[PDB]
Amino acid sequence: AIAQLATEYVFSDFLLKEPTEPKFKGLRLELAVDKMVTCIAVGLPLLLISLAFAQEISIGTQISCFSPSSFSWRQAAFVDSYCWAAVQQKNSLQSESGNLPLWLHKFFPYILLLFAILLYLPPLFWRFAAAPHICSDLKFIMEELDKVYNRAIKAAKSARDFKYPIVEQYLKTKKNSNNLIIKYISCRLLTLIIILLACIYLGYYFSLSSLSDEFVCSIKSGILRNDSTVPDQFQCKLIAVGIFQLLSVINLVVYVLLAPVVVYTLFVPFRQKTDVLKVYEILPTFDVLHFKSEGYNDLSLYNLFLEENISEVKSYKCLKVLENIKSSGQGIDPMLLLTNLGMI
Amino acid sequence: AIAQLATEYVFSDFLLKEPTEPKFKGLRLELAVDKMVTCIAVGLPLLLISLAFAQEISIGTQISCFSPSSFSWRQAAFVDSYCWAAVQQKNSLQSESGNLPLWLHKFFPYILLLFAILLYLPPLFWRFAAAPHICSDLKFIMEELDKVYNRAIKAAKSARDFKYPIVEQYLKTKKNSNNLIIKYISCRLLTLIIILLACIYLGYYFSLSSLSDEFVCSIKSGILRNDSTVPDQFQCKLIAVGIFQLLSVINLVVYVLLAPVVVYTLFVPFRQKTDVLKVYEILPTFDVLHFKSEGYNDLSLYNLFLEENISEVKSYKCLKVLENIKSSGQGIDPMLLLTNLGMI
Amino acid sequence: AIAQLATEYVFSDFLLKEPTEPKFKGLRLELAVDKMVTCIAVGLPLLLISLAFAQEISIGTQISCFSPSSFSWRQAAFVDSYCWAAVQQKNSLQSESGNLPLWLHKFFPYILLLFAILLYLPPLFWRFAAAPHICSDLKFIMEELDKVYNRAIKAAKSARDFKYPIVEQYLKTKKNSNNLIIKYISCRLLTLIIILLACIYLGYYFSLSSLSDEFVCSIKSGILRNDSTVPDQFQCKLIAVGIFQLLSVINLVVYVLLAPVVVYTLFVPFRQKTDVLKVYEILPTFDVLHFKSEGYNDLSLYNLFLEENISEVKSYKCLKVLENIKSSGQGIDPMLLLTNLGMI
Amino acid sequence: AIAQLATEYVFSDFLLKEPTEPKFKGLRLELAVDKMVTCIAVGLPLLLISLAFAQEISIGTQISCFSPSSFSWRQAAFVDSYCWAAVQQKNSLQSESGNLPLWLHKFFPYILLLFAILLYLPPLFWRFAAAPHICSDLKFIMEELDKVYNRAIKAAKSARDFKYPIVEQYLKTKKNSNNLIIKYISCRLLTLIIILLACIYLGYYFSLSSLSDEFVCSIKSGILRNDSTVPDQFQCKLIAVGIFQLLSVINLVVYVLLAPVVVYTLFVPFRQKTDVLKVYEILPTFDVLHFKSEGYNDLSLYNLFLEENISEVKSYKCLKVLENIKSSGQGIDPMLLLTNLGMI
Ligand SMILES: CC(C)CCC[C@@H](C)[C@H]1CC[C@H]2[C@@H]3CC=C4C[C@@H](O)CC[C@]4(C)[C@H]3CC[C@]12C
Ligand SMILES: CC(C)CCC[C@@H](C)[C@H]1CC[C@H]2[C@@H]3CC=C4C[C@@H](O)CC[C@]4(C)[C@H]3CC[C@]12C
Ligand SMILES: CC(C)CCC[C@@H](C)[C@H]1CC[C@H]2[C@@H]3CC=C4C[C@@H](O)CC[C@]4(C)[C@H]3CC[C@]12C
Ligand SMILES: CC(C)CCC[C@@H](C)[C@H]1CC[C@H]2[C@@H]3CC=C4C[C@@H](O)CC[C@]4(C)[C@H]3CC[C@]12C
Ligand SMILES: CC(C)CCC[C@@H](C)[C@H]1CC[C@H]2[C@@H]3CC=C4C[C@@H](O)CC[C@]4(C)[C@H]3CC[C@]12C
Ligand SMILES: CC(C)CCC[C@@H](C)[C@H]1CC[C@H]2[C@@H]3CC=C4C[C@@H](O)CC[C@]4(C)[C@H]3CC[C@]12C
Ligand SMILES: CC(C)CCC[C@@H](C)[C@H]1CC[C@H]2[C@@H]3CC=C4C[C@@H](O)CC[C@]4(C)[C@H]3CC[C@]12C
Ligand SMILES: CC(C)CCC[C@@H](C)[C@H]1CC[C@H]2[C@@H]3CC=C4C[C@@H](O)CC[C@]4(C)[C@H]3CC[C@]12C
Ligand SMILES: *[C@@H]1O[C@H](CO)[C@@H](O)[C@H](O)[C@H]1NC(C)=O
Ligand SMILES: *[C@@H]1O[C@H](CO)[C@@H](O)[C@H](O)[C@H]1NC(C)=O
Ligand SMILES: *[C@@H]1O[C@H](CO)[C@@H](O)[C@H](O)[C@H]1NC(C)=O
Ligand SMILES: *[C@@H]1O[C@H](CO)[C@@H](O)[C@H](O)[C@H]1NC(C)=O
């Protein structure tokens, strides 16, 4: 039913499931905005397909041709289904709007499903190509940060009672390589292109006269060509075309609202702000150098991924609260770090 | 519904499930490109079968013959079903396009399912013949790499405060044997042949006049041969033939796009690049010799499998980050290895 | 739907489920070739049954008799169902092909299910009679091999820094007893006989004229015997008979391709090759004697089972890699064994 | 569908599920032959019921009466259902075969279900009355055997570097009591009686003329008794009666084949052979006395249960392999026991 479809597609974890594998434990592997965009762009057309043929909104068959009274119910079914299959056969029907409107009315669910699949494709390519590498690198970064925080707190405790910047060097090296950012940008751009094409198609579908669903149908090919009792033509109407138009304009509105989000996601360096690593700069064991900004490189993407999935790190949380308390300046950063005792 | 089929076949883990057994824990056993190719080539025809008979796109019965008005609904059903079963009986029907078009229109779902099964067969043969052996060998290689990394870091720590290349010898021995690569190439070639045959069939199906679905049917065998009230013949149309043609051309496009991927996978030595073992060459306990390239042997396949499923190895990840930092050259490889302290 | 049936019967673990019990943990208990043969021979006829009555390929009812126009729809249903039930009643119908073709057309799903059950019976007898014993014996053999490997490596380590061949004696004793091999051969032979009988039946079914589905039906027994308004006879056609013939020839092709596999499995001693125990002959604690070949005894079957399910043994894997490295001969077997340190 | 029913009833664990409780962990509680007999005798009639009304074999309604053409479809439905309900009302119908054939044709599924329930009853009584006691006793016996084996191996190791026969005394005491064997024999005898009664009924059902399904029906009681437009009687046929007869003869064949198995299971002392305890007689800590044979007592039943579910005992497996090696006589039993080191 309508409610079941809603629960499946909006109120449930449709495409929101975390990776079902121990490799990615607690790692999103996908930005929240991108996940929202993909979920909307994929599960909206599916939801509209399901709604358009719901047991309640749907009167019944998808086409009726109004055969003469003399025709039996089976002859009427023959006429209806013949015209349904003959929307593609151009000679069979003669409609003012043409034959493309009939093609579109018959295959609208297929086109919506195609758009959903094409929008889900780039996310899947990301997941199966660039997600494992970024996940491994981010796990390494998290482990390095936790280890350096533990070493710093241990040193502070020893004072009260190697030292090489491996992670910073790794980030600096990542500053040059840009394959990951290139893949991300290409996926976002393809998603935007697919969304714009879908908007064009939906606008064309919704701009129709709304009478193109009605077409003239002629069962007059073969032995029935010269038959007399059969009328020369029939009046057929494609049902649910208005519902398709309504759902198409709804999807068009959603996609036009979503496209600005897509271009914003494409403009990654502007998103690269609120330095996550600035918090760690107070640790004696961590070098005071962020050096991550203003670059169309994988470093900005890694910074965004950290800002997205760093709240799960206890050391980062402790450093963040220490910096927050430093806003007043009443205490001292090393004293607060020693007092916290948050190694694990 | 359409959306349920889409969720099952594209947005879910259809054929993407990892082995349900402790023997293969975290091991793909299949290259990402090959898994994509198999998933597409198998779940596309199934998806098209499901779509073609969806409750919405489908008007109703698969054939209607337009019996005279005098005929009852049961007589009409008899005529329709008789012609449905008589598409195979050549004498019963007389169609301009012949009888093969009618056979194909009636059995298109069967042919798509046959193609899906034939494309899934080589992957299954791989899984049940060559996957256990490669999995065991790769687990041995991973264990050897982890052990040698642990020994190297322990030796470095001891210095700061056997030695036989077993894995390299095993790889060198694998360089000669080629049964695994032969099986892989044979499976890929059979998949390519099946895909090309499917493309030929789909092109033939889509090249039909689109009027071959209409055939003349004669219920005039037996006691009804000389009956007068029954007309000498009927006008029958095979419904969903246009939808079958649309889906067949879609599958043809997908398969022609996919075949280049298949030939690329077949050309394995060119894929054999970005030496995974080059990272380990800096370890004192590991001999500095890759010796894996330019060969139609199982060694290249093992190299590809390593490059595919080596990101899960912490020692390999540490070595990779060490080499990445070595790009700048600021530090020293042994110093970085000692500082990392990433035994486990 | 067709796709759901395919996913259930070919793309899922249909009859491929490992034993759901702790007694057999990681043990196949069945050769890969035999499992493939059983899975095909069982799930093919079931798949064909499901396909033949699929919602898409199936026009509707399984028989239509074309009652006169004057007959009501309920009278038509009576005639159709009466003839359906009277295919068995010989006097009721008069068909040129006889009555056995009608019996077969009506009961084809039952016959396919019977063949599937009869082919699944010998595997089930194997599982519930001979599988526990072989599983226990093979677990004992694996434990003995692991223990002797551990003792050998411990002795080598002690040198660097009982001894009775219990497993070999057990294998030698098994050389005489042949109940297990006799049961295996009997099951394979019964499977082959059932397959050949199924091939004969399917060939007979597919060799029919294809017009035997049409039979003349007479509702003229009882009070209707002398009734005038009812015609003396009707023209009935058994629907899906052509689909049954197509599926039967497909199953015939599959079974004729499979029977050579069955005879190959029956010829077990020829399969008994690539001595699995030859690898263990280099261990000082293991006697250098294979003594397992050229015998219609349970020893060959045990050798096959070992070759099938020995890859899970770490000691066997280590010995295999040691022998593989010995192909070059650069190193020494005891030195490699000491260096491996693969006790557990 | 047919295939789904087959998978549920033959290819799945129908009545083969082990007890879902920690009390019986790895204990069958039921002999393999008895479990097979019960599973067949219960799930065969259910399978036949399901098959007889399958969506494919079933034409439609279970009865059709061929009301005159003037009758509406609702009047025809009234006549059909009235006759369906009036098969029991003797005055309403007049059939040559009588009224018992019609009763049986209408209630065949009920009778098959009754036979299945009556055959499942004795197994359930066994499970809920005698299974816990035998399970506890057998667990005690297994624990005693494991303890004595451990003590014997410990004594042998001590020599190289109480003693009361509690289990044998318990078995000797069990030799007298016979309530368990009496219950087992009574259950088997009741199963045999039910099977024979089912065979008699199925033979009577299959021996019918096959025209007894056709009966004359009279809707002439009440206000319709003197009505003129309604014919004095109708020609009704009970559909699926031939299918019921086919399935009944199949079940008869299965049951007649099964009854010899039942009488063999009833003759338990002859089954009591291949002394399981003879293997333990070589242990110094175990008295050399089997004393279990030739008795209609619970001791033979316990011996059978041990022979059925003793393969899971590591001590028994070790003793069995020791005795097997003793066939050659090359070594010594105590030496082999010491070398095995299989305490746990
Ligand atoms: C998803 C993408 C490919 C959709 C592209 C736009 C589609 C939906 C529509 C929008 C406007 C349409 C065009 C409008 C006008 C004409 C002129 C006519 O004589 C032939 C068809 C043609 C040329 C149409 C083809 C299809 C069209 C391009
Ligand atoms: C992403 C944004 C830009 C989408 C907004 C929808 C736009 C593109 C839609 C809305 C109305 C549409 C037009 C409606 C009518 C016609 C006439 C037809 O003969 C050619 C196409 C044409 C000219 C359409 C082109 C696309 C169109 C302009
Ligand atoms: C999956 C594989 C086997 C499909 C092979 C191609 C099939 C689909 C088609 C493509 C072209 C077809 C052929 C085209 C023309 C003819 C000539 C005619 O007088 C007999 C049939 C015959 C000989 C056809 C047989 C079937 C055919 C070969
Ligand atoms: C994998 C690639 C090559 C597939 C491309 C589809 C090709 C093979 C298709 C497209 C159109 C097809 C042709 C269409 C019409 C006919 C006429 C018929 O009487 C014989 C087959 C023949 C000549 C077909 C052969 C196959 C064909 C050429
Ligand atoms: C599964 C096994 C039992 C099937 C055995 C073969 C079956 C399918 C068929 C193949 C050929 C058939 C026979 C062919 C010819 C005749 C002669 C006829 O006057 C009586 C039936 C009889 C004797 C048939 C009986 C059934 C038969 C034996
Ligand atoms: C496993 C292999 C051998 C199976 C091959 C199928 C064979 C056995 C099939 C194919 C055609 C069949 C024949 C077709 C027609 C008839 C005529 C009939 O009156 C008697 C049976 C007989 C003579 C059949 C016997 C079985 C048959 C020869
Ligand atoms: C399950 C058990 C109870 C079934 C017992 C057998 C049943 C199926 C059948 C087999 C033979 C049958 C009997 C055959 C003949 C007659 C004579 C008739 O004038 C009255 C019914 C009576 C007496 C039948 C009663 C039912 C009967 C006993
Ligand atoms: C377990 C074994 C013995 C079952 C074998 C089935 C036997 C018992 C069946 C097969 C044919 C049957 C007979 C068929 C016909 C009749 C005539 C009827 O008026 C009385 C019952 C009677 C005489 C049946 C009694 C039971 C019967 C003999
Ligand atoms: C129908 O009748 C017309 C009359 O002109 C004729 O041309 C045509 O061939 C006929 N069609 C058939 C199928 O006979
Ligand atoms: C039908 O009538 C024709 C008239 O020529 C005759 O040849 C044929 O045998 C008849 N068919 C039947 C089944 O009697
Ligand atoms: C039908 O009428 C015929 C006329 O010969 C007669 O023999 C037969 O008995 C009648 N049938 C019935 C059921 O009265
Ligand atoms: C039907 O009519 C008959 C005529 O004899 C009469 O006996 C009977 O009572 C009537 N039935 C009813 C229900 O009035």
JSON list of C-alpha atoms in Angstrom, two decimals, chain D residues 168-272:
[
{"chain": "D", "resi": 168, "resn": "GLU", "atom": "CA", "xyz": [28.76, -52.06, 33.17]},
{"chain": "D", "resi": 169, "resn": "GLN", "atom": "CA", "xyz": [26.70, -52.47, 36.34]},
{"chain": "D", "resi": 170, "resn": "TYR", "atom": "CA", "xyz": [24.24, -49.86, 35.05]},
{"chain": "D", "resi": 171, "resn": "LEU", "atom": "CA", "xyz": [23.90, -51.73, 31.76]},
{"chain": "D", "resi": 172, "resn": "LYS", "atom": "CA", "xyz": [23.43, -55.02, 33.62]},
{"chain": "D", "resi": 173, "resn": "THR", "atom": "CA", "xyz": [20.67, -53.45, 35.70]},
{"chain": "D", "resi": 174, "resn": "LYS", "atom": "CA", "xyz": [19.08, -52.11, 32.52]},
{"chain": "D", "resi": 175, "resn": "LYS", "atom": "CA", "xyz": [19.13, -55.68, 31.21]},
{"chain": "D", "resi": 176, "resn": "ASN", "atom": "CA", "xyz": [16.19, -56.51, 33.50]},
{"chain": "D", "resi": 177, "resn": "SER", "atom": "CA", "xyz": [13.96, -53.46, 33.06]},
{"chain": "D", "resi": 178, "resn": "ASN", "atom": "CA", "xyz": [12.00, -53.50, 29.81]},
{"chain": "D", "resi": 179, "resn": "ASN", "atom": "CA", "xyz": [9.57, -50.55, 29.96]},
{"chain": "D", "resi": 180, "resn": "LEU", "atom": "CA", "xyz": [11.56, -48.64, 27.33]},
{"chain": "D", "resi": 181, "resn": "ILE", "atom": "CA", "xyz": [11.68, -51.57, 24.90]},
{"chain": "D", "resi": 182, "resn": "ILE", "atom": "CA", "xyz": [7.98, -52.25, 25.50]},
{"chain": "D", "resi": 183, "resn": "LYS", "atom": "CA", "xyz": [7.13, -48.64, 24.65]},
{"chain": "D", "resi": 184, "resn": "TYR", "atom": "CA", "xyz": [9.33, -48.76, 21.54]},
{"chain": "D", "resi": 185, "resn": "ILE", "atom": "CA", "xyz": [7.74, -52.00, 20.35]},
{"chain": "D", "resi": 186, "resn": "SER", "atom": "CA", "xyz": [4.23, -50.70, 21.03]},
{"chain": "D", "resi": 187, "resn": "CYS", "atom": "CA", "xyz": [4.91, -47.52, 19.05]},
{"chain": "D", "resi": 188, "resn": "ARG", "atom": "CA", "xyz": [6.37, -49.49, 16.13]},
{"chain": "D", "resi": 189, "resn": "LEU", "atom": "CA", "xyz": [3.44, -51.92, 16.17]},
{"chain": "D", "resi": 190, "resn": "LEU", "atom": "CA", "xyz": [0.90, -49.08, 16.19]},
{"chain": "D", "resi": 191, "resn": "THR", "atom": "CA", "xyz": [2.75, -47.45, 13.29]},
{"chain": "D", "resi": 192, "resn": "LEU", "atom": "CA", "xyz": [2.63, -50.74, 11.39]},
{"chain": "D", "resi": 193, "resn": "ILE", "atom": "CA", "xyz": [-1.09, -51.15, 12.09]},
{"chain": "D", "resi": 194, "resn": "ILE", "atom": "CA", "xyz": [-1.81, -47.60, 10.92]},
{"chain": "D", "resi": 195, "resn": "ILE", "atom": "CA", "xyz": [0.26, -48.21, 7.78]},
{"chain": "D", "resi": 196, "resn": "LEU", "atom": "CA", "xyz": [-1.62, -51.42, 7.01]},
{"chain": "D", "resi": 197, "resn": "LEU", "atom": "CA", "xyz": [-4.98, -49.71, 7.54]},
{"chain": "D", "resi": 198, "resn": "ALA", "atom": "CA", "xyz": [-3.86, -46.90, 5.23]},
{"chain": "D", "resi": 199, "resn": "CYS", "atom": "CA", "xyz": [-2.83, -49.48, 2.64]},
{"chain": "D", "resi": 200, "resn": "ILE", "atom": "CA", "xyz": [-6.26, -51.13, 2.85]},
{"chain": "D", "resi": 201, "resn": "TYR", "atom": "CA", "xyz": [-8.01, -47.79, 2.45]},
{"chain": "D", "resi": 202, "resn": "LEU", "atom": "CA", "xyz": [-5.81, -46.70, -0.45]},
{"chain": "D", "resi": 203, "resn": "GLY", "atom": "CA", "xyz": [-6.33, -50.02, -2.22]},
{"chain": "D", "resi": 204, "resn": "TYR", "atom": "CA", "xyz": [-10.08, -49.68, -1.82]},
{"chain": "D", "resi": 205, "resn": "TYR", "atom": "CA", "xyz": [-9.91, -46.12, -3.15]},
{"chain": "D", "resi": 206, "resn": "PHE", "atom": "CA", "xyz": [-7.79, -47.12, -6.16]},
{"chain": "D", "resi": 207, "resn": "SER", "atom": "CA", "xyz": [-9.93, -50.19, -6.92]},
{"chain": "D", "resi": 208, "resn": "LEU", "atom": "CA", "xyz": [-12.98, -48.02, -7.66]},
{"chain": "D", "resi": 209, "resn": "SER", "atom": "CA", "xyz": [-14.41, -48.08, -11.18]},
{"chain": "D", "resi": 210, "resn": "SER", "atom": "CA", "xyz": [-13.17, -44.48, -11.78]},
{"chain": "D", "resi": 211, "resn": "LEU", "atom": "CA", "xyz": [-16.76, -43.60, -12.80]},
{"chain": "D", "resi": 212, "resn": "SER", "atom": "CA", "xyz": [-17.97, -43.33, -9.20]},
{"chain": "D", "resi": 213, "resn": "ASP", "atom": "CA", "xyz": [-16.87, -39.69, -9.26]},
{"chain": "D", "resi": 214, "resn": "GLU", "atom": "CA", "xyz": [-19.87, -39.10, -11.55]},
{"chain": "D", "resi": 215, "resn": "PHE", "atom": "CA", "xyz": [-23.09, -38.99, -9.52]},
{"chain": "D", "resi": 216, "resn": "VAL", "atom": "CA", "xyz": [-26.63, -37.84, -10.24]},
{"chain": "D", "resi": 217, "resn": "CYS", "atom": "CA", "xyz": [-27.69, -34.81, -8.19]},
{"chain": "D", "resi": 218, "resn": "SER", "atom": "CA", "xyz": [-31.21, -33.58, -7.45]},
{"chain": "D", "resi": 219, "resn": "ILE", "atom": "CA", "xyz": [-31.97, -30.07, -6.17]},
{"chain": "D", "resi": 220, "resn": "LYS", "atom": "CA", "xyz": [-35.58, -30.97, -5.44]},
{"chain": "D", "resi": 221, "resn": "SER", "atom": "CA", "xyz": [-35.94, -30.57, -1.66]},
{"chain": "D", "resi": 222, "resn": "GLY", "atom": "CA", "xyz": [-37.99, -27.72, -0.25]},
{"chain": "D", "resi": 223, "resn": "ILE", "atom": "CA", "xyz": [-39.76, -25.15, -2.41]},
{"chain": "D", "resi": 224, "resn": "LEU", "atom": "CA", "xyz": [-37.89, -26.47, -5.48]},
{"chain": "D", "resi": 225, "resn": "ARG", "atom": "CA", "xyz": [-39.33, -29.98, -5.07]},
{"chain": "D", "resi": 226, "resn": "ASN", "atom": "CA", "xyz": [-42.32, -29.31, -7.34]},
{"chain": "D", "resi": 227, "resn": "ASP", "atom": "CA", "xyz": [-40.68, -26.63, -9.50]},
{"chain": "D", "resi": 228, "resn": "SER", "atom": "CA", "xyz": [-40.92, -27.32, -13.23]},
{"chain": "D", "resi": 229, "resn": "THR", "atom": "CA", "xyz": [-38.23, -25.22, -14.93]},
{"chain": "D", "resi": 230, "resn": "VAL", "atom": "CA", "xyz": [-35.52, -27.00, -12.91]},
{"chain": "D", "resi": 231, "resn": "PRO", "atom": "CA", "xyz": [-34.63, -30.43, -14.35]},
{"chain": "D", "resi": 232, "resn": "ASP", "atom": "CA", "xyz": [-35.34, -33.41, -12.14]},
{"chain": "D", "resi": 233, "resn": "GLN", "atom": "CA", "xyz": [-31.61, -34.16, -11.87]},
{"chain": "D", "resi": 234, "resn": "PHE", "atom": "CA", "xyz": [-28.13, -33.12, -12.98]},
{"chain": "D", "resi": 235, "resn": "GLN", "atom": "CA", "xyz": [-24.92, -34.80, -14.11]},
{"chain": "D", "resi": 236, "resn": "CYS", "atom": "CA", "xyz": [-22.16, -33.98, -11.62]},
{"chain": "D", "resi": 237, "resn": "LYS", "atom": "CA", "xyz": [-18.56, -35.17, -11.69]},
{"chain": "D", "resi": 238, "resn": "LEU", "atom": "CA", "xyz": [-16.09, -35.03, -8.81]},
{"chain": "D", "resi": 239, "resn": "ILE", "atom": "CA", "xyz": [-12.88, -33.61, -10.22]},
{"chain": "D", "resi": 240, "resn": "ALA", "atom": "CA", "xyz": [-9.38, -34.70, -9.17]},
{"chain": "D", "resi": 241, "resn": "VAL", "atom": "CA", "xyz": [-10.69, -38.18, -8.31]},
{"chain": "D", "resi": 242, "resn": "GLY", "atom": "CA", "xyz": [-8.31, -39.72, -10.83]},
{"chain": "D", "resi": 243, "resn": "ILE", "atom": "CA", "xyz": [-5.43, -37.72, -9.37]},
{"chain": "D", "resi": 244, "resn": "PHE", "atom": "CA", "xyz": [-6.47, -38.89, -5.90]},
{"chain": "D", "resi": 245, "resn": "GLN", "atom": "CA", "xyz": [-6.44, -42.48, -7.15]},
{"chain": "D", "resi": 246, "resn": "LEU", "atom": "CA", "xyz": [-2.98, -42.07, -8.70]},
{"chain": "D", "resi": 247, "resn": "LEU", "atom": "CA", "xyz": [-1.56, -40.51, -5.54]},
{"chain": "D", "resi": 248, "resn": "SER", "atom": "CA", "xyz": [-3.27, -43.16, -3.42]},
{"chain": "D", "resi": 249, "resn": "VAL", "atom": "CA", "xyz": [-1.70, -46.02, -5.37]},
{"chain": "D", "resi": 250, "resn": "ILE", "atom": "CA", "xyz": [1.66, -44.25, -5.09]},
{"chain": "D", "resi": 251, "resn": "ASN", "atom": "CA", "xyz": [1.23, -43.97, -1.32]},
{"chain": "D", "resi": 252, "resn": "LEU", "atom": "CA", "xyz": [0.14, -47.61, -1.21]},
{"chain": "D", "resi": 253, "resn": "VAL", "atom": "CA", "xyz": [3.32, -48.68, -3.00]},
{"chain": "D", "resi": 254, "resn": "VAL", "atom": "CA", "xyz": [5.45, -46.59, -0.64]},
{"chain": "D", "resi": 255, "resn": "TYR", "atom": "CA", "xyz": [3.70, -47.96, 2.45]},
{"chain": "D", "resi": 256, "resn": "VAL", "atom": "CA", "xyz": [3.93, -51.59, 1.35]},
{"chain": "D", "resi": 257, "resn": "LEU", "atom": "CA", "xyz": [7.64, -51.08, 0.69]},
{"chain": "D", "resi": 258, "resn": "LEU", "atom": "CA", "xyz": [7.97, -49.42, 4.10]},
{"chain": "D", "resi": 259, "resn": "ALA", "atom": "CA", "xyz": [6.14, -52.02, 6.20]},
{"chain": "D", "resi": 260, "resn": "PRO", "atom": "CA", "xyz": [8.99, -54.58, 5.95]},
{"chain": "D", "resi": 261, "resn": "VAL", "atom": "CA", "xyz": [11.24, -51.87, 7.38]},
{"chain": "D", "resi": 262, "resn": "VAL", "atom": "CA", "xyz": [8.76, -51.47, 10.23]},
{"chain": "D", "resi": 263, "resn": "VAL", "atom": "CA", "xyz": [8.73, -55.19, 11.05]},
{"chain": "D", "resi": 264, "resn": "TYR", "atom": "CA", "xyz": [12.54, -55.24, 10.87]},
{"chain": "D", "resi": 265, "resn": "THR", "atom": "CA", "xyz": [12.67, -52.35, 13.35]},
{"chain": "D", "resi": 266, "resn": "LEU", "atom": "CA", "xyz": [10.20, -54.25, 15.53]},
{"chain": "D", "resi": 267, "resn": "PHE", "atom": "CA", "xyz": [12.56, -57.25, 15.56]},
{"chain": "D", "resi": 268, "resn": "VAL", "atom": "CA", "xyz": [15.13, -55.40, 17.65]},
{"chain": "D", "resi": 269, "resn": "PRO", "atom": "CA", "xyz": [17.30, -58.27, 19.00]},
{"chain": "D", "resi": 270, "resn": "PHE", "atom": "CA", "xyz": [18.35, -59.28, 15.49]},
{"chain": "D", "resi": 271, "resn": "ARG", "atom": "CA", "xyz": [19.31, -55.64, 14.91]},
{"chain": "D", "resi": 272, "resn": "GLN", "atom": "CA", "xyz": [21.34, -55.84, 18.13]}
]
